[PDB]
Amino acid sequence: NADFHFSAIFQPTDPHHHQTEFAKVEGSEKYVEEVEVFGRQALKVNPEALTILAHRAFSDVHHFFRKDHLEGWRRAIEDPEASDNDRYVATTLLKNACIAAGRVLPSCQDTGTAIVLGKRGELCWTGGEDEKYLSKGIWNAYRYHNLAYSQTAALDMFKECNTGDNLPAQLDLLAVPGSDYEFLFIAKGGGSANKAYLYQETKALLNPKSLRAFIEEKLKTLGTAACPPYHIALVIGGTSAEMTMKTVKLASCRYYDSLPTTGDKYGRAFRDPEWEKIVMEVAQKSGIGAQFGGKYFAHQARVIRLPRHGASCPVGLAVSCSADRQILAHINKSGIYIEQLEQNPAQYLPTSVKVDLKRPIDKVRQQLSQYPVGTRVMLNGTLIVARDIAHAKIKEMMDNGEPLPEYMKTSPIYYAGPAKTPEGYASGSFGPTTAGRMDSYVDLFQSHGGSYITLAKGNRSKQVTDACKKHGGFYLGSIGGPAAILAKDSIKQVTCLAFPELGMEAVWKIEVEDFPAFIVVDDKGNDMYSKTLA
Amino acid sequence: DFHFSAIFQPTDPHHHQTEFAKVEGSEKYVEEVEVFGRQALKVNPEALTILAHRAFSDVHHFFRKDHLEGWRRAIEDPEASDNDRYVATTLLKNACIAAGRVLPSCQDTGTAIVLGKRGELCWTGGEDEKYLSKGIWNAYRYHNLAYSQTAALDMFKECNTGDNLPAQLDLLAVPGSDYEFLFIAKGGGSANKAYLYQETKALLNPKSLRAFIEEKLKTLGTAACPPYHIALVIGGTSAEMTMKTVKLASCRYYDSLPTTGDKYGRAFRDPEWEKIVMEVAQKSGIGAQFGGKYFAHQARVIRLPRHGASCPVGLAVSCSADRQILAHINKSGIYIEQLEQNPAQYLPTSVKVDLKRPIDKVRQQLSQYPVGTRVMLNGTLIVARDIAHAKIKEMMDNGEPLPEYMKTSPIYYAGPAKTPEGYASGSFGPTTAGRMDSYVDLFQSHGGSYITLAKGNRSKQVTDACKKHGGFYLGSIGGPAAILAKDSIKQVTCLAFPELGMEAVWKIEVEDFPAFIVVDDKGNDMYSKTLA
Numbered sequence A: 001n002a003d004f005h006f007s008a009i010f011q012p013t014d015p016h017h018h019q020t021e022f023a024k025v026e027g028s029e030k031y032v033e034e035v036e037v038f039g040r041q042a043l044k045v046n047p048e049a050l051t052i053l054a055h056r057a058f059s060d061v062h063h064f065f066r067k068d069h070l071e072g073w074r075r076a077i078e079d080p081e082a083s084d085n086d087r088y089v090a091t092t093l094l095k096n097a098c099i100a101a102g103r104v105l106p107s108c109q110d111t112g113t114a115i116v117l118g119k120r121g122e123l124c125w126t127g128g129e130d131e132k133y134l135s136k137g138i139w140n141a142y143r144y145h146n147l148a149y150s151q152t153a154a155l156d157m158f159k160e161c162n163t164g165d166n167l168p169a170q171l172d173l174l175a176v177p178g179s180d181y182e183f184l185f186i187a188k189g190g191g192s193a194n195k196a197y198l199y200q201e202t203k204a205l206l207n208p209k210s211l212r213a214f215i216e217e218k219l220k221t222l223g224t225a226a227c228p229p230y231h232i233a234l235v236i237g238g239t240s241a242e243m244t245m246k247t248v249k250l251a252s253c254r255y256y257d258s259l260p261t262t263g264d265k266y267g268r269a270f271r272d273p274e275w276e277k278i279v280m281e282v283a284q285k286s287g288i289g290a291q292f293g294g295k296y297f298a299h300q301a302r303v304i305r306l307p308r309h310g311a312s313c314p315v316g317l318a319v320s321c322s323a324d325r326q327i328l329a330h331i332n333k334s335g336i337y338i339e340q341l342e343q344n345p346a347q348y349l350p351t352s353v354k355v356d357l358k359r360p361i362d363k364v365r366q367q368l369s370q371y372p373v374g375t376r377v378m379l380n381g382t383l384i385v386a387r388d389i390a391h392a393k394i395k396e397m398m399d400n401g402e403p404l405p406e407y408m409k410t411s412p413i414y415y416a417g418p419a420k421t422p423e424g425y426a427s428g429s430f431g432p433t434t435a436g437r438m439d440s441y442v443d444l445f446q447s448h449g450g451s452y453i454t455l456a457k458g459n460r461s462k463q464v465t466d467a468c469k470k471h472g473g474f475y476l477g478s479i480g481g482p483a484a485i486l487a488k489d490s491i492k493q494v495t496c497l498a499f500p501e502l503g504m505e506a507v508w509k510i511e512v513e514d515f516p517a518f519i520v521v522d523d524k525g526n527d528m529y530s531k532t533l534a
Numbered sequence B: 001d002f003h004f005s006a007i008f009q010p011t012d013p014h015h016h017q018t019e020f021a022k023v024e025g026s027e028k029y030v031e032e033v034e035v036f037g038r039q040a041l042k043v044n045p046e047a048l049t050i051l052a053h054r055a056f057s058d059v060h061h062f063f064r065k066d067h068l069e070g071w072r073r074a075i076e077d078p079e080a081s082d083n084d085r086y087v088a089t090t091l092l093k094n095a096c097i098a099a100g101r102v103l104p105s106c107q108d109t110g111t112a113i114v115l116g117k118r119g120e121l122c123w124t125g126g127e128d129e130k131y132l133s134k135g136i137w138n139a140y141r142y143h144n145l146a147y148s149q150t151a152a153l154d155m156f157k158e159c160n161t162g163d164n165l166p167a168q169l170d171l172l173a174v175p176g177s178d179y180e181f182l183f184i185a186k187g188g189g190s191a192n193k194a195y196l197y198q199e200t201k202a203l204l205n206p207k208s209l210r211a212f213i214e215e216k217l218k219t220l221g222t223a224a225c226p227p228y229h230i231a232l233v234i235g236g237t238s239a240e241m242t243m244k245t246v247k248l249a250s251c252r253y254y255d256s257l258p259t260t261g262d263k264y265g266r267a268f269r270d271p272e273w274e275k276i277v278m279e280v281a282q283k284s285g286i287g288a289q290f291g292g293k294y295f296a297h298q299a300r301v302i303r304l305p306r307h308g309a310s311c312p313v314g315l316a317v318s319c320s321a322d323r324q325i326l327a328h329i330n331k332s333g334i335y336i337e338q339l340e341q342n343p344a345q346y347l348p349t350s351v352k353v354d355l356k357r358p359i360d361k362v363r364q365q366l367s368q369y370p371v372g373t374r375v376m377l378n379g380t381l382i383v384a385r386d387i388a389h390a391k392i393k394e395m396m397d398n399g400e401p402l403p404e405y406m407k408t409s410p411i412y413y414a415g416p417a418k419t420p421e422g423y424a425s426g427s428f429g430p431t432t433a434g435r436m437d438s439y440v441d442l443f444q445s446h447g448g449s450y451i452t453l454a455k456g457n458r459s460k461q462v463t464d465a466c467k468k469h470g471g472f473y474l475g476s477i478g479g480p481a482a483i484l485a486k487d488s489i490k491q492v493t494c495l496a497f498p499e500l501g502m503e504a505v506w507k508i509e510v511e512d513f514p515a516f517i518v519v520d521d522k523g524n525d526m527y528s529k530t531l532a
């Protein structure tokens, strides 16, 4: 008991998040009861309060965003240095927030995995069944709202099925001092969750030349498949891999913003605003921008430097996609407090080649070949919808003798999946999905008469541009993210066509009007991303 | 239509299959009480200090049964190569020196990792992290361990903490009144072999997955001191949830999980693919660091639920310094997992090289032998690792010449633990060679680093520099840090950068140092058959 000083790794100057605006659930003070046991102050919390909080959290988060997420779209619209595509995407996204704020449609069709970061106090007593009540609140949120069941169960190593409730949830409940119960609810979409990268580097990385080249290199690997502008988060170091990958996501959700900006002899975590700006240079000098070239590739950056083993240096990269969905909350003696989000997003709000898709496919391919890559396109016609699990069955068909089905050859293939349908609505949120995940099917399906035109979001591999030039194909790129405004304004009629047992991932025929898209990969060999990402 | 199903449903959550020993006189730190009809437990927070102290002390000297049962199996198996028996015997012998409680099992005493599960009605005062850190502080300060943590004064300026703090303190909230623990001393090498891959649906088929495992296992190489406890996790709710699950699988925390999934997407062990990984490991021929069958002790494959668009896969290993201890505090006191106190019950050609000659006279002798030749070094070694190279390259990048100590003796990539009383040195095992690969061609172009001594395979950029500059890379046995200090290392002297802890520059006098020629001056590599 001498030269010992304890210093926690994370020492935030606002641990209880006072800078965040909270709203109180009306009549929630009845779910708590202050008691005194062995001289210490405790809080008997009704476990039903965990169900109600998760319900309101995972409901109101799919319709609203924080200020700094909307302040990044408006900045992308008003900044002169933003490309004409930067303003177009940011306006289309900011408009999608207004349609989503109407509480009828979710902000994105990928309602995301239910993630809960709970911190139960030493003297906060709920009965122990915290997970069951929290899961019931998530179960209530996705069953009684126009959300989507996104979780895939594993019956064995390969046989899979959907759960039908967007469960199970990531329930990481921590033990903390005190008697209060603090939360951070996250609905992390699949695309952003897939752009969480772990690199195991060495001491040779720790110098301003190498680290900058590392950032230049790794930021391009994120690409546009996670619907930029991103909230880029970067963590250098850590006590373990999982501690690094957990810290980078909390940085993306902006949980560690109140951390100090200087380290010490005790190895405390700290934000580095110097290199937060250096990260903003790489993002803005990349020219990748808002999905289609420009300056605003990232809303903002968060860089956290952690302690590390003398032999270890794990670094973590992750982003928060355009569907920035996180909510802070806490339960105390005063009741249930939940973070307020911007209810009115319109206050942040201040040439196209009409393509007919009702013509023969080869007559539509001829029209698209008349224009170079980067051409703004407005689709009007029929689209076939199919994604990963639908593709997995058609290749399984062709691997046994069955031919490529006819519906793949008639209309452009729209890599997407619909959310649940509201009452009196033509469809729920029906935004595009990551294109690069179905890259392995392009050359095969094109060799059998179909998939000549594909419609999705995100850059694709070189194997697709090669397959498109050979078979005379195209890859159309929709605006990734605006799933709500595409459902209300653009999508007019939806009809399940094949594999109805697959839920949202079935084969759908949809009639579409005024669908924004860009020609990024043509039948000649050009790619709109080869300048920014290759 | 709501049914709650937790992701992890272990059939032995409290780890009854693990044998626990009670700290004598620990029942005074607990008191069973009854509050609002439910049973609670007042735990003195000083009990957290004693448990963490005892845990991080006895874990550097003893191992579990299945870790020692894997070395004995590697010695007795007929299909094991003569090198498989040699490494497993040298490691198993190293445990006997370490079981003496004077020397740690490995020079890398590892990062202090604690997975605590405090019950809803387990009361400690809230200072669990402080008291757990004090117990870790006592363990590494009052024992012959090593301070492995590096603080960050800014983005690049660094310094050591001098106490092996901070610790990874992951305290979870669980029902009940008990406080259950898992103490881990994760070494650097095994912690650097934690890999996160973002894969797709196209991976989920027996053809792709088997070849995927074949592909990624080669990346582990021998740089993490095999035989490994290979762990593989397919799926997860997030990257961090996957990387957490794979490490617990490496520490064998999820062994009591079911073996079948259900419509609720519960986690489960896949014994079918646990063997498939063991086939690839045994059919790889990489073996115990130098070719053979026993590349891995055992495998653990866990299949998690996943997003319909996500498929995170996790790869991690537990190195030869497999250090984990389970514990729990209840009304009866402090119970801590028993490790094998007597490891000897699991226990059933060299080119003598003089290193006292001029360096070029020692390089000439090594060129007479092919790769894979067993060598016994006898002479002087210069010790330098990651931070020393970063400072010496900084010297040569500003005008200062390559220092004299780099050019005189073979470069020993290692770092010593603290020295016991009346001892020549503490544990002084080798370190991962691949981390100093970026300095070979530079240092060899300026007259030094012609002979390097470490463990683990290196990149092709080093084999080119060795053939070009006429150099060698000697491969020590990775892991036996205690038996190398007692038997092989006879005299140690700090040479430069004494503020760097283990990563300082050391001059050591060495006798009978086992090593293997893996990279010669011709372009050959003994791992090109197994790892390329």
Ligand SMILES: O=C(O)/C=C/C(=O)O
Pocket (backbone or CB within 6 Å): A310, A311, B107, B108, B109, B148, B187, B188, B189, B190, B414, B415, B430, B431, B432, B502
């Ligand atoms: O595992 C390593 O390579 C590091 C060993 C050390 O701390 O010297």
Ligand code: SF4
Pocket (backbone or CB within 6 Å): A108, A109, A110, A112, A188, A189, A190, A191, A192, A225, A226, A227, A321, A322, A323, A431, A432, A433, A480, A481
């Ligand atoms: S906005 Fe894009 S990245 Fe985010 S969840 Fe929706 S589709 Fe995925």
Ligand code: SF4
Pocket (backbone or CB within 6 Å): B106, B107, B108, B110, B186, B187, B188, B189, B190, B223, B224, B225, B319, B320, B321, B429, B430, B431, B432, B478, B479
């Ligand atoms: S046994 Fe090898 S990998 Fe494990 S800590 Fe020691 S040196 Fe590192």
